Design a protein around this nucleic acid. Sequence first.
RNA 1: CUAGACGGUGGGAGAGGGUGGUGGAAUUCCCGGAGUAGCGGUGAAAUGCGCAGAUACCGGGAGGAACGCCGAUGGCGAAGGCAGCCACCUGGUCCACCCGUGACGCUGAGGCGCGAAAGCGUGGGGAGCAAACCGGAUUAGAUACCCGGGUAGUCCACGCC
RNA 2: GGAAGAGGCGCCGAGGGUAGGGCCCGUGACUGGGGCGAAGUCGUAACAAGGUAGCUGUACCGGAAGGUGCGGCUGGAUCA
RNA 3: AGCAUGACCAGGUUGAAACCCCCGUGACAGGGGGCGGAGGACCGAACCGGUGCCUGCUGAAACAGUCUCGGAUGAGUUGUG
RNA 4: UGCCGGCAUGAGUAACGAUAAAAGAAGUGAGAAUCUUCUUCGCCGUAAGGACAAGGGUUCCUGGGGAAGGGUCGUCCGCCCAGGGAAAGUCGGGACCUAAGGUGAGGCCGAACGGCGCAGCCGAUGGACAGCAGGUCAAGAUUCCUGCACCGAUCAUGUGGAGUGAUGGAGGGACGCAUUACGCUAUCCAAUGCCAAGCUAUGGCUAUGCUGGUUGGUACGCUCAAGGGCGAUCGGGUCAGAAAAUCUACCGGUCACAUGCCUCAGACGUAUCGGGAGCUUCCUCGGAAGCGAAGUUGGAAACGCGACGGUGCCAAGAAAAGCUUCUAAACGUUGAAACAUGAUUGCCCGUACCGCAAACCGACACAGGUGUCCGAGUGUCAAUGCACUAAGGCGCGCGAGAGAACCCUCGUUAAGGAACUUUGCAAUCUCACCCCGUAACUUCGGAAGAAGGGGUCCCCACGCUUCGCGUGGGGCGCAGUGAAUAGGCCCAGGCGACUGUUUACCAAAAUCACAGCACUCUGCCAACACGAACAGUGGACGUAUAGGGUGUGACGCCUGCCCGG
RNA 5: GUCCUAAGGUAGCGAAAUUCCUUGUCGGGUAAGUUCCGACCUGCACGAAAGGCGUAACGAUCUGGGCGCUGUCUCAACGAGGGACUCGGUGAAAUUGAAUUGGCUGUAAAGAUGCGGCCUACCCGUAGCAGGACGAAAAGACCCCGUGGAGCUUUACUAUA
RNA 6: AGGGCCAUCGAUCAACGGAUAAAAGUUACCCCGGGGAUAACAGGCUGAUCUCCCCCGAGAGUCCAUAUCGGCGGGGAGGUUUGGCACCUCGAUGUCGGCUCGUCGCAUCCUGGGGCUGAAGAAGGUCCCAAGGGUUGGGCUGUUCGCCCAUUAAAGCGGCAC
RNA 7: AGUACGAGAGGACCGGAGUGAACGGACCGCUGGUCUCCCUGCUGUCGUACCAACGGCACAUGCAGGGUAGCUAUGUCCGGA
Lengths: 270, 46
Amino acid sequence: KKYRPYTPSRRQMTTADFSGLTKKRPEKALTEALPKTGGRNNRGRITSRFIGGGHKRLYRIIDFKRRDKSGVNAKVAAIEYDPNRSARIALLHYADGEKRYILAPEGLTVGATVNAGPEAEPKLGNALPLRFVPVGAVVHALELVPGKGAQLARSAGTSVQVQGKESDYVIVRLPSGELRRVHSECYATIGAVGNAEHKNIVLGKAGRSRWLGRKPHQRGSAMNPVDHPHGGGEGRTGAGRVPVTPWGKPTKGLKTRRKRKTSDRFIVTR
Amino acid sequence: MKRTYQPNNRKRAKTHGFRARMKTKSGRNILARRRAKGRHQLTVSD
RNA sequence: CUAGACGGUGGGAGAGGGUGGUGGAAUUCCCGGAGUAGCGGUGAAAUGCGCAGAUACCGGGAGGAACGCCGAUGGCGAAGGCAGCCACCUGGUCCACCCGUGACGCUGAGGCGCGAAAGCGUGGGGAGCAAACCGGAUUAGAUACCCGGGUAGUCCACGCC
RNA sequence: GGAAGAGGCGCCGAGGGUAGGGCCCGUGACUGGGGCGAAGUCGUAACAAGGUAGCUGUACCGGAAGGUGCGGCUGGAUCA
RNA sequence: AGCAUGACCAGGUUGAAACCCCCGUGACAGGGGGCGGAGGACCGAACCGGUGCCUGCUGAAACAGUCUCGGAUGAGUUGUG
RNA sequence: UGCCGGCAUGAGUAACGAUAAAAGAAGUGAGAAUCUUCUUCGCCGUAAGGACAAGGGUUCCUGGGGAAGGGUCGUCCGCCCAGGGAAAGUCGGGACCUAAGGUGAGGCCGAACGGCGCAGCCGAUGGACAGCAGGUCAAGAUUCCUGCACCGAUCAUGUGGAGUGAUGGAGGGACGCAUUACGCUAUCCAAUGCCAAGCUAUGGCUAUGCUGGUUGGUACGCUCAAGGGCGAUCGGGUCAGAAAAUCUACCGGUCACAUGCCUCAGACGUAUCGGGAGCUUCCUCGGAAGCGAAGUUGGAAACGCGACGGUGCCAAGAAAAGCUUCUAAACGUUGAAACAUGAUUGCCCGUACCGCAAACCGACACAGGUGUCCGAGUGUCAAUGCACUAAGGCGCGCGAGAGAACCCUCGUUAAGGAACUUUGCAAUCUCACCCCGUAACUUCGGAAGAAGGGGUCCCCACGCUUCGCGUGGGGCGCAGUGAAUAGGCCCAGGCGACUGUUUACCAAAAUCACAGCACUCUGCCAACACGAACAGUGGACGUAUAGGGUGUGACGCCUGCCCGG
RNA sequence: GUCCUAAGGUAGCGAAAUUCCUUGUCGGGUAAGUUCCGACCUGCACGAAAGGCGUAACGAUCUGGGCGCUGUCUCAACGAGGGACUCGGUGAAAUUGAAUUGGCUGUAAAGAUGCGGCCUACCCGUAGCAGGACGAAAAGACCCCGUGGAGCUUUACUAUA
RNA sequence: AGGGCCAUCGAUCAACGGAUAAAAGUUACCCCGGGGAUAACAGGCUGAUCUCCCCCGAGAGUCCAUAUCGGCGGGGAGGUUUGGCACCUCGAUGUCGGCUCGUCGCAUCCUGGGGCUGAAGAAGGUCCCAAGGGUUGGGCUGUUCGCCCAUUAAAGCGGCAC
RNA sequence: AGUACGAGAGGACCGGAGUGAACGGACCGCUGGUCUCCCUGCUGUCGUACCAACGGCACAUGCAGGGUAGCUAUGUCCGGA
């Protein structure tokens, strides 16, 4: 009884609890193609990760933003949800050669303009150098790759405030990693998310997604004397700050040193 | 119901059927592990 | 018929409201800097931070929330409640010049609105301080009053009494 | 020669029963609260700056009356 | 388990959200039903697997039979690979 | 307490198989009860039918003999013996495309073997018919006889008078769920609609009482488009679909919702020739059978055809040959190809047997076994539950007597209805449709389709009546949907929030199993997984309100002093 | 008051699927109980997240009763279709030294039928029954012995990605 | 480099003939090797504790041994009271209880004729003798046992691997 | 027998006809079932074209009831003096 819009959150019905999905869409026929791709689940003569890993693969396809531009004039109209994650994915337009999925701020009916050109339009735009951040509203297209540029693919967050301008030239915050001023020299598409919260919005029950895309997990403690200690008591656990094969359940920190994060401090989470 | 095997032997052709021990060189000697190794005929053509 | 009620012109008043950028003395601290032996805090003391450089001092930085001076018998305001720049919108208010409609109205368990701080939930959020909990310490005894920390919380949206 | 008693009867209803409902008095091992009696117990928030000037609103604790986050209030003696 | 192409479900009961006219209704939240069409709902055939006695352990078979259930608008089931 | 080979005895008893009736005339001859020509009986017939799927490979036949087998045996086999039987240009492989995955010279790496992968082939059920019904012996059929569809095809003439060669982007074949009907006949049902072979002492009728039998695609019609989507001549892609252009894309007029892109079963829907009982032709067994009449009217379900038909939902539903979407070097002016037509084609293999079937797997022909297509019938809300006949499968690997104990199976009781006993599992009881009728608790949508009350067949003044009910006088029986079909009821205490797993054969429970939240880490060519090989992707083609481990598991209040260890 | 401090029990329930000690102690149900509950509390050694309680439907989970029944138990009763008996064919397996294979009481490494001492039967066939051979099967696999094995865990000695 | 020899020093190894300097728990999922010459459930040698009788005087009975008991203790039958033994049973004999068949013994659980009775009767209190017979239904439990409800002439004791 | 006994409640050694139990049989003709073929009642399907009228199926009578010859207990008599 709050956000936009229709969340199948059935307040206890019949084998379909408080769901939560979709929105509006013009409904597109079906995607024209899907370069390269391949698949999922497992790899390298083995398998890896025993959590999730359903049926439906691919669909996502690349989304190379702006590698060139120099003068384009686009338009935008339709749109289409598709990648592995519920996040929509826009629909772009133009008429030159390729398509390249493009990003999508908030939803639109029948209009727009677009230019993708350094100094162009207040509204929706694309390609342009980086110093262009007076206010720095919703981004939803950030990226780290000089010639390239893409990154994110999720309807979660996608909104960063840009810092000032001092030595070492560092600015812009990031989704959820507090205070970590990153070095920067690229671009994005600056636009909203469309159904922000809509990314981890609850489902009814279990058995219509976890198989149907991903896989059935909520486990722990193998109770396996061999490499899995957790398991061998009257029904308690006693001591043992162990997770699995003594992997340290607690923080224990991790990656540091590194290229970057050598002048990109402050990354602590609460 | 399902037994433990049932007909249709594709994985006894281009894998383990007559000429499918070259894909696995050290299987050639295995193929030759009851022909040019000891007595007896073979086991893939009765 | 206009005394009442009602709308017009012309002006004025403020902390009335919702939204957006923020102005700076702020105070906890991240870091470098100068670089000694105590700081702190009670009416007497301490958990703490001291030989790792504490106390404090210059700068770069993260931020959230508050809005001194004007402030007084003040204003807004049905009232609750509200004292930083500007703007989109807006409420109630003032006399003179009467313009006219011409009794067209004041109240009213029942409802709708408001809904002092805090308190519920979803997500966010975190400097200062604070219920629980926890320390040095009063005294016989001290889950009070001192000091020292900190969770919901004091914070934005929306639904409650 | 269309006939009395009614002879077979059609829903009424006396009356008994198998069932669902509400209501009432008494009953009830156990337990919460109000007053009674030598004012029985241990300590002492609030009456005076009754050792935090005072009640209350919600909220946690916790032998108890009570402790703490803030606000209203004058029903606070006085020189903050 | 994971991968693909096809497939199995005769009905009844409950029949909710969406769509529409009206309305005490300023705004407008809300109220009547209409169609709508939801729900691992209902009986339970087919379909998956089974709670207990039974005959019988050279018995039908080194393996069963009779009666009671749920899944049956789906954390359903299936052919082959 | 061996091992094989043989003789054993348990002993002639237990047993012949799911207990789902059978008698007989007659053929034969070695006698005949289970063969054969056959009138009577009954079990299944959403089957224990027929075809397709795997299988067995010799099933089926012209039939033939017991040595042995079919756990009697037998003149029956599908035992054993020679021959016979599944006739292709379109139903079947490939070549035209493909998900798991395998493989792939070079190569990414590994001690070799190798793992894997770029250009690739495969690997499938998968994308790909343009004919239907008749004439068929011992067995085979849409290949054999007849009216009949031709997708592209073999050459050449006649409107074209000029176009075209790749991986293609296309439009699209690329379809998720469910509901509603807005469509539908075969098939089915209304039979006296058409034509009749003719009628029974039965009692009874001969006439609105009566057996039976009668359309098909090629073709296309304001008497087939029920129904879903707006069409065209000028300019350009302010630079790529590895070029261009008659695919896509967007901007300016005159048509510019002045016009169409689009079909399941039709009131010629037809040329067709099959059609009841038949004269019976026949050694008047087997049956080879001449010839031949009714070319009609509506009304019931589809998972058959609309079926990206619509609204709605999503957990958001593959790249995909072909009439069809586009061509560059070159090819090309009078000939190359798309057109009409005569002529011409799809190669070998199955197309026969049982087929959720004693013949295919259970050590055997043991009462086991899972897919696909139809699926007459009245009756019954539907009913594939439930009775019985089709078509078809059939008495199953037996037979009779007496039918003691006892024994498995079924039914009916005087006396009490659980006192029985570890506890009503079992047993056995019991739960129609219509109407009115209906609680403590409750997230009010429920707990109950509760309890309870009347009827539901028949003559009749009478409906939307081609079918229900209905104000009524009444009819049969002790009782009326009456056969069959079926939640036992209620309060409370212990566990779990119910749908899921399984002791593959004792045991399915308070046990694991759901979102929410609790501890995080990784935070990228990522943590982790398998991999000594990093190559690999899963993660996801992702970088976070994301994933790996760990806890309880609706929601409501809450979750604490010992970190000596 | 003090020992221990590393600390040092509160929400619920409290013979409830934690009580030995006892079926606790009062009370409802018929007469009544190791039982169902309502509580008390001197709950062997309940609890904070492998939680506490609450808490509707629903789960082939234990307990109480009742409603009509289940005619289970008393005697259950009788009948049937099929096995036990007439006849034709087929007839095996688990196993086993050997049968003129009755019993007592006694005796025996004491559970004797061939032993003791005594008594006793006309021999055989088949139906039927269990006391019987220390009934059958794998040389108990519950256990112990065995300088046996495998399997899991713990900081066991230690290797090791 | 070393060796032996003269001698000599390094281990609460205080598991002290130790033997290595060098080391834990766990299975009712178990497999095997054997086994009552290595337990437990029955017999069994035994006879602890079990039921019953014997000794005279203290003490009840108004006093008063014995109508009935008996400080302390003394002889044993039985022994199935929980067992001491490890003798064959591990080429393997599976608790207890419940229905039913039950059939034995008597010390007699209820009759009978008898001793006495501190017994008027009604009815018992203990003892003598042999079997002739016979001995419930509910509650719970798996129940041996047990107490709770009413009955019953009364509701047995030791049989039988309880 | 309301006596011996008992100051009062009450009540015998002997036997007597008499009511009962699980408990031996018997017997059909007092009570009942059983009866799977003898009939009536009813729904659904067929065979007689078709009808009063009947048969095959519903456990080997479908469903409601009835039933002899037999059997046995609650049926009746006798049982230990």
